[PDB]
Structures are given as structure tokens and as C-alpha cells.
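Input sequence (202 aa), recorded before submission:
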Amino acid sequence: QQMEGPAAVHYQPASPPRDACVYSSCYSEENVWKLCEYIKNHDQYPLEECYAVFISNERKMIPIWKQQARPGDGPVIWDYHVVLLHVSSGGQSFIYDLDTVLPFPCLFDTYVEDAIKSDDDIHPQFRRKFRVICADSYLKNFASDRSHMKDSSGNWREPPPPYPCIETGDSKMNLNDFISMDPKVGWGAVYTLSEFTHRFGS
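Predicted structure, C-alpha cell format:
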């Protein structure tokens, strides 16, 4: 037997159920944005408890396991991937990944163990870095004109989401500032996998 700060055994999800969420494949930066917007307009949790988390690396080649685009025990290799992190008031963190086969939401430790796994036995060019942006800052500053999703001849590589492009008064396109893992660029903090789990893991 082994015992276990406070536990969120009665955690109420900050989002609608998985099948009720706005979702477009290969637009997880917008899928997470729409979750932040919901949390903002819903008056359930403070937006300051939530973060958008960009996962990528310098070579833009990151494996993620337990992904719906690859059912089974193999990884999907993304150029980048975005999830939502909710640090509940007791300290327990939850991951909202509309693309995972793990629960939605998922306990932070479980998502790190099954979806992310250790970088120790991963070829170093595939190792993951994390940019953590406050959901309030994310809603206030993120902009994407989706131009990165046009193909060789100006057609869509993936069909876009069915709502207008996310815009701010300051920019129509700063997605590269979020995919970048350069701490001298953009908003939020950039962490290695160890720093990320040291920060939010229990």
C-alpha cells in the first residue's frame, strides 16, 4: 500500500465534453483558443488558472503518443502541437487535448507519462520543448491568418475551421512566435520537458 497537495477527485471539467467542442484537425492552436474563449465566457473558472501549451522543437519534429491520428502504440510526429493546461486551485493540473485518446480532460501526470514520455531514450533531435502562455495573454495576443496551411498551389492542405480567422488589433499572423521555442521570442515561458514537469507535475 502507498498513500499520496489536495486531490481533485471531484474535478469539474472546464470545457464541454469532447464531442461537444469546436474542433478542426491540424488546427489545434485554434482548437485550444476556442477552449480559452469558452472558459472566458463561461463563468466557472478564472482564466488565469489556464494556459495554452505549444509543444515543438527547433527542427519542428516532435513525437506525441496516444494520438487519434495514429491509434495504437506508435507516435504521431507533429511539427507542433497545442493543448490546454488547467492548474486547478488545489494544485492538480489537467491537460485538455482534443486530439488524444486519453481522457478529456486528463490528469497532468498521466498525460506526461503516456502521451509525452521521457526524452531520456529519445533521439535528441526529436526532444520536446514547451511554450506555456497564460490563457488571458493567449486570447489577447494570438493571431493567425492560416496562411501556413496553404499548399504548393494555394489550396488548403487541411480544410480550415468554419469561422473567421482569429485576429487582434496588433496582428493578423504571429503563429510563428508561438511555435518558436526561442525564449527571446513571443509570450509566455519556454521549458524543457524536465522543467515543464518539474513546474506543473505533482
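Checked by second reader. Helices lie at 28-41, 108-116, 135-141, 176-179, 193-200.
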